[PDB]
Copies of this chain bind each other. A is one copy, B any other.
């Protein structure tokens, strides 16, 4: 049953300082905003995902990006803790700057960068995160993540 995780919206800061934000918009879709980090400023609406419940309070959000980045987030909701593996093509660990946009406006651009690569070797980032903020926005709220990070109010 995914009802537990669908609509969950949270900000979470990885052990390496990166402040990420997810809204699980439905059983197969997240929005996300990166506030801090390698790719701070980057955000994404309607990222197609695999979401599954691995046990009671252990959800997994799995996806591949137009950049070629693959991601598997284990989200432990009640425990307010998260683990992300990020499989960055070499060209995003090297030159992440073009990926820092509203991606939905630059999908063919991202795939063009993706295709020339270099894809290999992959740069894997495995980090725990503390979930600092967490709320239920319900399904299909396009207003949860509808701006870049810096365009949020100073208390968010």
Chain A positions within 8 Å of B, measured between CB atoms, are 50, 52, 54-55, 57-58, 60, 62-64, 68, 70, 72, 74, 76, 79, 81, 83, 85, 87, 111, 114-115, 117, 119-122, 124, 126, 128
Contact = CB atoms under 8 A, between A and B. Distances in A.
A28 to B, nearest CB: 11
A114 B62 CA distance: 22
- Give the oligomeric copy count: 2
Contacts of A81: 54
Contact of A122 (B58, B70, B120, B126): B70
A59 to B, nearest CB: 10
A115 B54 CA distance: 34
Nearest to A74: B54
A70 B68 contact: no
Contact of A54 (B58, B68, B122): B58
B55 A76 contact: yes
A50 B57 CA distance: 22
